[PDB]
Amino acid sequence: GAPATVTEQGEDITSKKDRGVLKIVKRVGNGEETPMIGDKVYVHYKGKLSNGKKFDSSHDRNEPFVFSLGKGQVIKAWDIGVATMKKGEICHLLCKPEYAYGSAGSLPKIPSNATLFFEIELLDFKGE
Ligand SMILES: [Cl-]
Ligand code: NA
Ligand code: NA
Numbered sequence: 001g002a003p004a005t006v007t008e009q010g011e012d013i014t015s016k017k018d019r020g021v022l023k024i025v026k027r028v029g030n031g032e033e034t035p036m037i038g039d040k041v042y043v044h045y046k047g048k049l050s051n052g053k054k055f056d057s058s059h060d061r062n063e064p065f066v067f068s069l070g071k072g073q074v075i076k077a078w079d080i081g082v083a084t085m086k087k088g089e090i091c092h093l094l095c096k097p098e099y100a101y102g103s104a105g106s107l108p109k110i111p112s113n114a115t116l117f118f119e120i121e122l123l124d125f126k127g128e
Contacts, residue, residue, distance in 0.1 A: 003048065003117040006094045013084055014099075021077045022094040026119070029086030035125035037070035041082055042123040047116055055109040055116075064123055075100045077116070085122040093118045 010022030035041050042064045046057040058065045067073045069082060077095035085091060095116040097103070105112045 002092055002119075003050070003094065006092045006117065010092070010094055013080060015080075018098075020096045020099045021080050023081060023084065024092045025089060026092060027088070027090035027121075029089030029122065031086060034083060034086060035069050035122070036127055037083075039069050039125045039127050040066060041069045041125045042066050043082065044121040044123060046119050048118075049110070050115050050117070053109070069125070075116075078118075078120075082120065082122060085120070087122055087124060090119065090121045093120060 006022055006024050010024050012019045012021070013023045014020050043066075044058045044064055046059065047055050049055055067078075070079050072079065074082075075095065077093055077099035080099070081091065081093045081095075095118065097113050097115060100116050101110050101114060103112050105114060110116070
């Protein structure tokens with residue numbers, strides 16, 4: 001399925017080239033511009049654990065998730081991966097724990113040492 005495909009066929013987007021964050025573009029977005037550090041970014045997402053359980057979805061809440069890019073407000077895989085996206089793009093990201101919640105995990109649903117799969121849509125980005 002999609003997690004296996006990104007694991008085996010995804011592109012390493014890390015600057016370290018350590019395969020910690022792998023990406024596949026699923027829906028090509030608009031234009032060429034990617035968001036800037038500090039921009040307000042608006043995303044829809046769904047996350048799954050490696051055991052197949054869905055742990056989060058903004059679609060289910062009927063509102064996007066909003067954060068300032070490149071500020072550590074989200075897991076490192078999201079700062080790195082959203083910075084590569086175009087407006088309107090949908091991608092899959094596979095996130096090793098070193099780019100996610102590490103040995104701590106995150107209650108209630110994310111265990112220690114968890115590799116995470118996301119589908120992310122970049123809805124919009126705005127500076128000031
Ligand atoms: Cl799938
Ligand atoms: Na596929
Ligand atoms: Na892109």
